[PDB]
Design a protein around this ligand. Sequence first.
Ligand SMILES: Nc1ccn([C@@H]2O[C@H](CNC(=O)c3cnc4sccn34)[C@@H](O)[C@H]2O)c(=O)n1
Ligand SMILES: Nc1ccn([C@@H]2O[C@H](CNC(=O)c3cnc4sccn34)[C@@H](O)[C@H]2O)c(=O)n1
Ligand SMILES: Nc1ccn([C@@H]2O[C@H](CNC(=O)c3cnc4sccn34)[C@@H](O)[C@H]2O)c(=O)n1
Ligand SMILES: [K+]
Ligand SMILES: [Zn+2]
Ligand SMILES: [Zn+2]
Ligand SMILES: [Zn+2]
Lengths: 151, 158, 155
Amino acid sequence: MDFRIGQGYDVHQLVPGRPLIIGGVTIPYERGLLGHSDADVLLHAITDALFGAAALGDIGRHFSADSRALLRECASRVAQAGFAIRNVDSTIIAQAPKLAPHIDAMRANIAADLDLPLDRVNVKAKTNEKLGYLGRGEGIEAQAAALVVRE
Amino acid sequence: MDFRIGQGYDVHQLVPGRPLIIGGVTIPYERGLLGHSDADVLLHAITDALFGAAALGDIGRHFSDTDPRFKGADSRALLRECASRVAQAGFAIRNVDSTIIAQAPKLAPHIDAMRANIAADLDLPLDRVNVKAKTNEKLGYLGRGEGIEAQAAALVVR
Amino acid sequence: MDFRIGQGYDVHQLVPGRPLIIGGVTIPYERGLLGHSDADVLLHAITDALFGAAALGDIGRHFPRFKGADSRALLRECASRVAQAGFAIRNVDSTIIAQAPKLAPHIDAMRANIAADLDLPLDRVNVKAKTNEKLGYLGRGEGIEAQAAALVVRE
Ligand SMILES: Nc1ccn([C@@H]2O[C@H](CNC(=O)c3cnc4sccn34)[C@@H](O)[C@H]2O)c(=O)n1
Ligand SMILES: Nc1ccn([C@@H]2O[C@H](CNC(=O)c3cnc4sccn34)[C@@H](O)[C@H]2O)c(=O)n1
Ligand SMILES: Nc1ccn([C@@H]2O[C@H](CNC(=O)c3cnc4sccn34)[C@@H](O)[C@H]2O)c(=O)n1
Ligand SMILES: [K+]
Ligand SMILES: [Zn+2]
Ligand SMILES: [Zn+2]
Ligand SMILES: [Zn+2]
């Protein structure tokens, strides 16, 4: 079968006076992510992995905003290109806040947006062990991998 | 044909007074990795990729400070336990690939031993396990030798 | 069937005085990448992902007969070794992280070079671009990073 893999990366700065939204979950926090749309770093990384697996370019090609609506439209285009999504895995790298209590809700949001069962979606969290701009809490990064199959 | 992919990331600080252990191999060096267990950044990244591919969460969700089974366990015991939980969930491991990013020391003479260790721990043939090494071209905290990063990718099938 | 995955990473410093070559494409810019070969960070990452999927070690283990060889030559040789190991390449995806210059205009050219070198249909090759949102050495324009993923199948 015609399997394809995709990978994605995103990072945004953390700034005061923005809500913190990751994987579609609003997380109580004194800072939020700054950037394109609601700056949901995890959903953007996943979106890039899916477009990448389908060889449809990247998120900026498609979407010159609720990042869940963008993920759903990404999933629609990937399906229209003839691909079915098989699984998604991902990592969020953040010094803070603690993400564990929110991870299951993120997984559920992604699963809903991709029309996948929960057991085909995974979200992992890491600190950066105090190193670099991530260790200093200046931003949050997300990484994603996706497997799709054509037809 | 129910294939799944997983990806893993880890980084630890390099500190004096600790052995450098990567892929289960003790490498001569004036500093070693600081962290959970023996801070084996490569085995941790692989562990997370495998949990990821099986949609089992992550290393921190499985292995706590609170668990007497894993108190002071080295990263190879954890990797073996990861493999156990992946099998328990109905998955077989097909291959692992990885990259260690370290400005220093030279990892080349140690790579095949790392591969051998991982293959043994995962019950895989050598030809389904790969480890690569990169410097960071003196950029950032990696380039300054403040820490070492590892990245991993894993394919499994249910 | 006998699928395998691979992943690749590369980074090079960005300095005045060298041409900027990414994915085989010369891109007009005041600065260029410094490093192994012609420092094509994207082709190097892809090469590493392919050797990784085939469990053949890494680019430095493979590449004397290669002094002065440019990265497309290296990619092509990589592709040959992957095939002789029994693997057919199914797809490649990748991301370039560069604060500047704008890479979008050059993406099709990169994809075309990579697909040619790998003997792949164009629709099995993808290249994405990201800024680093002004964070870190990448965000300050001190270097450019590439990440790659490759899927292969034995026979
Ligand atoms: N050096 C760079 C860096 C980036 N890009 C492109 O610049 C574009 C920027 N990315 C977005 O627009 C974006 C990210 N997240 C969201 S949600 C709605 C749009 N977006 C992408 O196409 C990149 O390919 C580029 O051409 N060159
Ligand atoms: N911002 C963050 C960052 C991390 N974590 C969680 O924090 C957890 C932490 N990590 C481990 O215990 C760990 C890493 N390596 C080893 S070996 C034995 C345990 N471990 C992970 O579950 C993360 O999901 C979190 O909840 N929020
Ligand atoms: N800490 C490190 C870091 C790297 N390496 C090895 O050092 C080697 C360095 N990488 C290259 O030679 C290289 C990268 N891009 C090109 S084009 C022609 C050669 N190359 C790799 O084999 C790594 O395994 C190592 O042994 N120890
Ligand atoms: K990184
Ligand atoms: Zn984003
Ligand atoms: Zn670790
Ligand atoms: Zn390079």
